[PDB]
Ligand binder design. Sequence first.
Ligand code: FMN
Ligand code: FMN
Ligand code: FMN
Ligand code: FMN
Ligand code: FMN
Ligand code: FMN
Ligand code: FMN
Ligand code: FMN
Ligand code: 4LR
Ligand code: 4LR
Ligand code: 4LR
Ligand code: 4LR
Ligand code: 4LR
Ligand code: 4LR
Ligand code: 4LR
Ligand code: 4LR
Ligand code: K
Ligand code: K
Ligand code: K
Ligand code: K
Ligand code: K
Ligand code: K
Ligand code: K
Ligand code: K
Lengths: 207, 207, 207, 207, 207, 207, 207, 207
Amino acid sequence: MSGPERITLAMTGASGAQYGLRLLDCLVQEEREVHFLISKAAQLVMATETDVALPAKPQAMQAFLTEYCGAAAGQIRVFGQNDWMAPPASGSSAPNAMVICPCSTGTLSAVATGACNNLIERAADVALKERRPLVLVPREAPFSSIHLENMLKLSNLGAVILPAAPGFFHQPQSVEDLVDFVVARILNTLGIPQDMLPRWGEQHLVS
Amino acid sequence: MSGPERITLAMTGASGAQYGLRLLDCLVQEEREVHFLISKAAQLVMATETDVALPAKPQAMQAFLTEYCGAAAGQIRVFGQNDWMAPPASGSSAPNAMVICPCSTGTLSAVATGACNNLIERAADVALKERRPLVLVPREAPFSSIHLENMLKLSNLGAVILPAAPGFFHQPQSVEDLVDFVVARILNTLGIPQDMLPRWGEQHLVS
Amino acid sequence: MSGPERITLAMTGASGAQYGLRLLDCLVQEEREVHFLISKAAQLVMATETDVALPAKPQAMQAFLTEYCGAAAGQIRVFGQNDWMAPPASGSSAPNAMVICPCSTGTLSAVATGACNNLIERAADVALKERRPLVLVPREAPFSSIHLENMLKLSNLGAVILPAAPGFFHQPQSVEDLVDFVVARILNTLGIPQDMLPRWGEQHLVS
Amino acid sequence: MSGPERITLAMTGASGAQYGLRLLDCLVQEEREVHFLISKAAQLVMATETDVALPAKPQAMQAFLTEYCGAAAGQIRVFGQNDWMAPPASGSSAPNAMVICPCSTGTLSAVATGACNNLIERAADVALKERRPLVLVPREAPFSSIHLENMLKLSNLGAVILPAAPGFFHQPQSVEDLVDFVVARILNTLGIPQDMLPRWGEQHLVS
Amino acid sequence: MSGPERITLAMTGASGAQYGLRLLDCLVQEEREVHFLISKAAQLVMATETDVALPAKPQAMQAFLTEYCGAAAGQIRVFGQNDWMAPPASGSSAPNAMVICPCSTGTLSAVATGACNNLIERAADVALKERRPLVLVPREAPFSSIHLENMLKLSNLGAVILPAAPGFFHQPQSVEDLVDFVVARILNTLGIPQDMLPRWGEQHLVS
Amino acid sequence: MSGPERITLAMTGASGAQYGLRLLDCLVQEEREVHFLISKAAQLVMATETDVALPAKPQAMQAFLTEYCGAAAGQIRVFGQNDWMAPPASGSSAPNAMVICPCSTGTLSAVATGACNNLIERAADVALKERRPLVLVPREAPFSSIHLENMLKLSNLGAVILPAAPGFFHQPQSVEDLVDFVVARILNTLGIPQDMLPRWGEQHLVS
Amino acid sequence: MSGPERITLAMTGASGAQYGLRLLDCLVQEEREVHFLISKAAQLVMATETDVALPAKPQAMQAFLTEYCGAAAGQIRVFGQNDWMAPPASGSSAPNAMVICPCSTGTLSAVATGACNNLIERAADVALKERRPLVLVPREAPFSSIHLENMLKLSNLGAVILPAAPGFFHQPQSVEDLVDFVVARILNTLGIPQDMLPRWGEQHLVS
Amino acid sequence: MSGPERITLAMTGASGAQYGLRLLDCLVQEEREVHFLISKAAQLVMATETDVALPAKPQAMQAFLTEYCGAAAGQIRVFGQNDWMAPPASGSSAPNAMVICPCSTGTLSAVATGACNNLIERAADVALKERRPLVLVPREAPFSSIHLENMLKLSNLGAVILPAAPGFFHQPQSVEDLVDFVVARILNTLGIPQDMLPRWGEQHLVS
Ligand SMILES: Cc1cc2nc3c(=O)[nH]c(=O)nc-3n(C[C@H](O)[C@H](O)[C@H](O)COP(=O)(O)O)c2cc1C
Ligand SMILES: Cc1cc2nc3c(=O)[nH]c(=O)nc-3n(C[C@H](O)[C@H](O)[C@H](O)COP(=O)(O)O)c2cc1C
Ligand SMILES: Cc1cc2nc3c(=O)[nH]c(=O)nc-3n(C[C@H](O)[C@H](O)[C@H](O)COP(=O)(O)O)c2cc1C
Ligand SMILES: Cc1cc2nc3c(=O)[nH]c(=O)nc-3n(C[C@H](O)[C@H](O)[C@H](O)COP(=O)(O)O)c2cc1C
Ligand SMILES: Cc1cc2nc3c(=O)[nH]c(=O)nc-3n(C[C@H](O)[C@H](O)[C@H](O)COP(=O)(O)O)c2cc1C
Ligand SMILES: Cc1cc2nc3c(=O)[nH]c(=O)nc-3n(C[C@H](O)[C@H](O)[C@H](O)COP(=O)(O)O)c2cc1C
Ligand SMILES: Cc1cc2nc3c(=O)[nH]c(=O)nc-3n(C[C@H](O)[C@H](O)[C@H](O)COP(=O)(O)O)c2cc1C
Ligand SMILES: Cc1cc2nc3c(=O)[nH]c(=O)nc-3n(C[C@H](O)[C@H](O)[C@H](O)COP(=O)(O)O)c2cc1C
Ligand SMILES: CC(C)=CCOP(=O)(O)O
Ligand SMILES: CC(C)=CCOP(=O)(O)O
Ligand SMILES: CC(C)=CCOP(=O)(O)O
Ligand SMILES: CC(C)=CCOP(=O)(O)O
Ligand SMILES: CC(C)=CCOP(=O)(O)O
Ligand SMILES: CC(C)=CCOP(=O)(O)O
Ligand SMILES: CC(C)=CCOP(=O)(O)O
Ligand SMILES: CC(C)=CCOP(=O)(O)O
Ligand SMILES: [K+]
Ligand SMILES: [K+]
Ligand SMILES: [K+]
Ligand SMILES: [K+]
Ligand SMILES: [K+]
Ligand SMILES: [K+]
Ligand SMILES: [K+]
Ligand SMILES: [K+]
């Protein structure tokens, strides 16, 4: 396979829960192992914006998502917000790429300042120190200078700041096509195959 | 009325032409005067992503948009890319709020560095020097550090950086609902009434 | 009326609970709507420094303050520290001015770094991104370089840093006169009428 | 009326005394209250460059300017350089917009560094801390890096740096037309009506 | 004794003359030698805000304060604003701790930029270069970014920025108790004994 | 002769075409060789603000200016905006001093960022890299922080930023006297003799 | 002659009055015209450290120094501290090199921040803006970070910071030989001949 | 005793060998233990500028200086330039204050950048990391921006930059009195008694 075998996927409490669930589904379809993390605010966001009845506690959540995505047993690992015994908490862990999708301004802040108040923030801290892939998907508008300064610092350190800003150049017809555009870009960034978003210009030889 | 009587609306060559056309339509419905500017690349974007057959030259374009939006004669002014005799080129002009929607990375760059290679860039330069409202709506992902540095500099100077990043917290059902979310935020930023996006929590008294 | 119709008033755990309660009382007397927030540490401060027996939970607190200030029903809204459904959590809310009085060094830090760990911090983040008024009233001495750097960053972004540093130039006779001096300055900053602190020099025509 | 009711007008010792006197005259014609301040060096500049025989001391000066401009009694207040009992010395004063016209490099420096060695410098310090309008009209050439750094710092803090650099695009025929161009720009900046400088392009609908 | 034998106490023209006089009284009671300096504006502040009839010239002032505080002959030295022959003007002097209480924004500025326009400013310059204690007690609100930048630079260089911001956690009953809180903090900073403000938590062994 | 034998004189599209034409005339009278460059926008400015009927293309322009100024054949060279074969395009050229008068904000920006989109911008880039004289004459008001940052960067690198800000201290009687003041300052900066503006104080021996 | 025909020599209130008087004497012996300025504190320094009975007022001072140095009539011009009609106050003056010897920390500060509170500070401001030579001779120890920051800013702008730090490598036998070392370095910096300090290594051909 | 019991005294290859030898003599007279280090270039400087016939190797050097200063056996320790077994090489050593007198620009550079190419540079690195006193005595003129940047960085970190810049305010009569002035300042900085330089103003009670 091209791309990482294992992805830490963290969902935090920005609007755009559909992006995280769709990414999770695509990662599972590409036979990747997913270490799944979710903040308390992201649970509230998912309750508000989707019809997904996500259980509260990690093992029920794991059973639930494994069924929701059609994953294999053990393919989705779920870890709680203070579970320091999980692989993402230490750089001695097997290497994973990490994506925070969606990324709240509060989680962006914690990662930029090194905060490490829950396992999502610590996992990001580990990714940066180990020079492992870290993709942040912020969903906010306007962006203040505080947001922008935090994104710049992390981009300068090699994190990918991929805002939930879909393009329209493949004539989307539905909300799902817009969600898929952003998910495609994430997968492209990770180097994981996807066929939702064609390769621009691939056919074009001259002019 | 609340908000500005006159808006300079510039469309540049980022994906998201639908945002600009919908904003234009809403401004017209709120009886605002619109000074409309469009880059050569934005004309190509509109051709590619929409079914709008926009004429090339300013007076035909003006006739066209006035009909497309149901505007009054003279309500939409269209100015070409080197028309220095237009109001936006000088700070001695009557005050206008300016929005660049969508804003390409190239136009973001020109505005951040002071470039002033066409009338859109000069108009933004004027807005900043006169301390008139300037809203930029970038559409790009990932954002590089170059993008982020340009957005930060302008945000620090009081421009509003409003990325084309719609939220999902009012359960959008269509592409149009997502377009309207971003347009609503722009209008809110300008202080122009809108009823596409309710006031969050306005009903909520306690808990 | 001059000034904002609605104020988010956050009390955090610095010494100076009397400033917050007096501001609350003045806002109510000027017929403003107050969205009231209070941190867990600020509850402890109020217990220690005042004889106000503030209830713990938001609806009892609301009933209590509405009586304490002589407010109208619904004039004071109280929201808990994780109540994301409250207006201050989103920039799509109706516009409010925000004051954090008193402001602890910890809350100053969170606002400067974008932290957004409770509703006070998120509300401040929203005020900054929406370019709505934000006044911070820090109470600390000495100020370290960490404090000063945090205040500078926020001042440069257009927040008003109004330290709880009363003047003596209108010959205060009591603790209450000093409290009122600072409250007056806050109201002046917000553009809300007050008659506790005269307009300096207003009578003086020459010399 | 549009614009501020009260303006602090400070004249400092740069060449361009005619700009200050013409602004003073226009403010008086627009029925504004003017708190007038003048430095010792600016008195020497006015003696050298104009035929205005300005008295030395504040009450004689006030009597003099009230007659020179055709102002109402009390419309022009004159305050001496150490008169801390004047409104501009305290932020508890009634709000005023402040203009320093012309602004010497020495006064620019004092305002940028926070110096507060006379009432002009203190008044500027107050305007900045209260977020009241502050317009500086420097007259110098070349500008050194020291000048430019001082202007940048103040511009970044929201002061308007309006150099005494008239334009020629309304075909000036006299020294007075050039003086009026700069005065017009100041009034435009303050939001005070003026009809010396037309609104650029106001007639132009297309091309 | 603990703490410095000699303190340079400078009073400058911020509101809060009571803090300086109370500190002076406490230093005298702790048998310290005080080199007392006072600015022209601080003389005006003391006239306005207090009933202390301070003589204008240094020897009469010295006689006056020695009586006002019950000091020993020679215990309070008073030096004029251009007296370069006084100990504080040279780093070859015997070591002293220096406090500027209250500190105006103008004096803060001079010390941060190295100005050295009177003996207070030069004495501060000397303290910094000799790495002798320097405590500044600013009294201002709001603080602008200019103030904050000046305080930060000096804090980074090891000056103590101690704003006149009293706490309420020992239930003050009078203006005097608030004045004493700030004076206590200054003495604590200098390492001089005081019994106005108890040692927080000194009794508390667990929980 | 004192001063440079050859000057590259670039006119760009700021108001103040009269300054460029008067400088050109003075350079010709001082028997200097002038490499003359003019932007497309500056052609429009000259059409609008002056009665000079400047031809469009370089050889007709050259014939025209040689007659307008009374120059010798070959004394004024005119080069088009993409003429890379002209001396100013390479640092291997014979040394010239360069003046951009007037300098638009857009040209200021290009020079500060190194843009090199036409021969004026490239010529400035060459002057800086070769450490040859470069004088910029901006005409704009207000100056934004973007302008000021661009001017500062270039001043720090040894360019002379000479704003079109005439003084009044030699009692100008006409628009021409103000134009001549700025032209005089440019010539002084270049070290070229001029007798329009006397040497200040040259007669004054004492007091 | 090599070097400047005219030197502005400013003496300020640092220890090292002997350096200024010796430089003055050497400039006179090299037939240079000297525009001499002296601060009030430097007058006190000269009284304290030397046996030179310098008169207080500019014309008596001029008569005095012309005799003390054996100068020609008119060769030394003396200008008072507020004499704006003197050549050094304007950049339109004939070009001069400027030396501040000795330079106090207070004058260093004023020049670095652009202060322009007397004619010495303004003259330095003019030298920098006109890119005329400016040499500062500070005498202080230790140097604080404030001093060092001020010297760095001015050095980066092309001022020469020449501390009064004599070398011993030509085996000085007297205080005068040390004074002459520093004076020699100043003259070398200005490009004025001197034969007090030989050219190091001038005889040495190999090894 | 007041002050440190042990001083690391490093001599490097700036002019001013007399300062180092005189400091060494004074430290010995105050019964301090001296860890003496000397660079290869400083040996050449001492040969050139003094009549001291310093032996090359550490034990002969030690015998020599112990006799030259009248020290006790073991009071002066001499360590070679690569002797890592000496106390100054490790922060686990007993605490010492360190002085580099004189300090060359090359040694200043090494200390500012952390170089640690000989035992002098490493000893300074250790002093900084352990927060032990470090005094640098540079002898150079002019100071370039490189020097000044290096001194600033170290001053900001709490090193004392004490340039070899003697004052004249105690009317020196000989080269030795100037050497003693600088040595006095060093001892004052270290807190070691000295009676070469009186305490300025110690007698002065008023005026
Ligand atoms: C429905 C809902 C939508 C939200 N949308 C956003 C959003 O788009 N962006 C954002 O930064 N915060 C948003 N928030 C707020 C955060 O959830 C909040 O600041 C929280 O503290 C983030 O915590 P976390 O980073 O641990 O997930 C939203 C909250 C709710 C309830
Ligand atoms: C179909 C199409 C879509 C594009 N989408 C984007 C985009 O989303 N963001 C962007 O920065 N540039 C995009 N570009 C590229 C720009 O149009 C291009 O860089 C151009 O130079 C911008 O010029 P302008 O700023 O004058 O409009 C797109 C171009 C095309 C043709
Ligand atoms: C009685 C009391 C007084 C306090 N006074 C202050 C104060 O003046 N300034 C401050 O920054 N913190 C003070 N604190 C500490 C804070 O309350 C503490 O750091 C807390 O974490 C702040 O949390 P918050 O910002 O959520 O309110 C005080 C705490 C108590 C109990
Ligand atoms: C006739 C005259 C013209 C002056 N022109 C200027 C000028 O154009 N720009 C400037 O910065 N200073 C100029 N100055 C110098 C200042 O007046 C001087 O630096 C003074 O210290 C400024 O003090 P102030 O800022 O309190 O007015 C001029 C002085 C005189 C006498
Ligand atoms: C009654 C009175 C109260 C003042 N209060 C303050 C104050 O609280 N803070 C401040 O920075 N300046 C205040 N000022 C202004 C200063 O005194 C003024 O800016 C002055 O130039 C400071 O000079 P100094 O630093 O030499 O004392 C006050 C002045 C007066 C007369
Ligand atoms: C009549 C006229 C006057 C102008 N005046 C100015 C001006 O004073 N300052 C400025 O920066 N731009 C001014 N402009 C705008 C510029 O000409 C424009 O931004 C252009 O892109 C500059 O291009 P250039 O730098 O290649 O000349 C003016 C334009 C016109 C037509
Ligand atoms: C005898 C004497 C010696 C002084 N020596 C110095 C000195 O070496 N360095 C210094 O910066 N200030 C020294 N000062 C202090 C200044 O003179 C003082 O800070 C003054 O404000 C400087 O003003 P000026 O820059 O206008 O000359 C000395 C003062 C006196 C009286
Ligand atoms: C006689 C003599 C005098 C010197 N004077 C100085 C001086 O005053 N300042 C300086 O930085 N370097 C001076 N140098 C140069 C240095 O000694 C040289 O740059 C050397 O590399 C410094 O090495 P060090 O730092 O290991 O001692 C002098 C050299 C010699 C021989
Ligand atoms: C949870 C854990 C073992 C953390 C230590 O990880 P690492 O050495 O900091 O990468
Ligand atoms: C097109 C035009 C008249 C530009 C000059 O505008 P401004 O004086 O720079 O605001
Ligand atoms: C609680 C909530 C709906 C947060 C989203 O607000 P916004 O789009 O970030 O201003
Ligand atoms: C002259 C005076 C009362 C200054 C105090 O004003 P403020 O509290 O600093 O705005
Ligand atoms: C007033 C005086 C002797 C100043 C010189 O002091 P220092 O050498 O700069 O500490
Ligand atoms: C037009 C030309 C030959 C450009 C190369 O010039 P240079 O080597 O960059 O100074
Ligand atoms: C004293 C005087 C005429 C100052 C103006 O000089 P310049 O135009 O600022 O160089
Ligand atoms: C020569 C030596 C033992 C160096 C180690 O010292 P340290 O642990 O770095 O202070
Ligand atoms: K959590
Ligand atoms: K274009
Ligand atoms: K909380
Ligand atoms: K004055
Ligand atoms: K004073
Ligand atoms: K062009
Ligand atoms: K003076
Ligand atoms: K060596």
